[PDB]
A and B are shown apart, each in its own frame.
Chain A
Amino acid sequence: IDAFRLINANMMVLGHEPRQTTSNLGHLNKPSIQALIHGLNRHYYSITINYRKNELEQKMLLNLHKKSWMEGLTLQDYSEHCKHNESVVKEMLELAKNYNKAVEEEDKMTPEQLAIKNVGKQDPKRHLEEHVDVLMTSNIVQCLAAMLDTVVFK
């Protein structure tokens, strides 16, 4: 929101440096090179800003943006939770075979070479610990949410 305002080209012809800095508040942000290509400091000047906040709006946006209504008190497709759980584990097996593949070129050429070299084909490591987290948070939430309703509902 870099707001500006004109500086006098008359005073530019005078060669007189304007705006008489009396406070360490102006030269804090650094200007963009594209504005330096444009007028910037030959025709106008920069202005620092801030934002006026209160308490009253901050809460009524914070509590009013993304509030799930009763969603976690559901069961999430009770046939297909475990079926999707299969649908990750099945290729997680062969990705674990890649984890039985990628360990076996250690004690080899200088693992920065193992950093430049793994740029064409996927690693089992990061891809593995992805799916472990996905199955974990996929299962535990449905597990507990399945069990609150047995107490709360009779």
Chain B
Amino acid sequence: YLMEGSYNKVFLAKGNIPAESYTFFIDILLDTIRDEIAGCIEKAYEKILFTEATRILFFNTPKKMTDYAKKRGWVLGPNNYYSFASQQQKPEDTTIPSTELAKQVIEYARQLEMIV
């Protein structure tokens, strides 16, 4: 279930630990959810109030939401998760293709004319 986007079902498996305690392992399973959606909270999430993404993981209103909201962005606002999204700077390069590709054209011409 950790493979796909199954998330609430993982918390249902946190509602069903049938064999024994498994506590030392489901707490590392807590942490591996914490950094997970602490990471993928950063997606195309246009605006969310302090309810939904608040109560999906664990924390309603401790200052843990200040720990994530000030650790990363998604700044504490007027019932607001701020969607900052630039995704503009790094494209439009011919030069790195004009370096790597200029290498590769010579790599064509080596095994094109010169006997080996």
Contacts and interface: CB of A to CB of B under 8 A. Distances in A.
B102 A136 contact: no
A40 B94 CA distance: 73
Contacts of A143: 105
A151 B105 contact: no
Contacts of B112: 136, 140
A10 interface: no
A144 B105 CA distance: 7
B94 A140 contact: no
Contact of B94 (A136, A144, A150): A150
A147 interface: yes
Interface in A58-77: none
Interface in B53-106: 94-95, 98-99, 101-102, 105-106
Interface in A124-154: 136, 140, 143-144, 147-148, 150-151
Contacts of A147: 98, 101-102, 105
Contacts of B109: 140, 144
Contact of B95 (A140, A144, A151): A151
Contacts of A150: 94-95, 98
B108 interface: yes
Interface residues of A, number: 8
How extensive is the interface on chain B, given as a class? 10 to 19
B108 A151 contact: no
A140 B102 CA distance: 11
A148 B102 contact: yes
B99 A144 contact: no
A152 to B, nearest CB: 10
A140 B98 contact: no
Interface string B21-65: 000000000000000000000000000000000000000000000
Contacts of B105: 140, 143-144, 147
Contacts of A144: 102, 105-106, 109
Given A144-B109, A147-B98, A150-B94, 17 more contacts: A136-B112, A140-B105, A140-B108, A140-B109, A140-B112, A143-B105, A144-B102, A144-B105, A144-B106, A147-B102, A147-B105, A148-B102, A150-B95, A150-B98, A151-B95, A151-B98, A151-B102
Interface of B: 94-95, 98-99, 101-102, 105-106, 108-109, 112
Interface of A: 136, 140, 143-144, 147-148, 150-151
Q: Which 3 A-B pairs have the closest CB atoms?
A: A150-B98, A144-B105, A147-B98
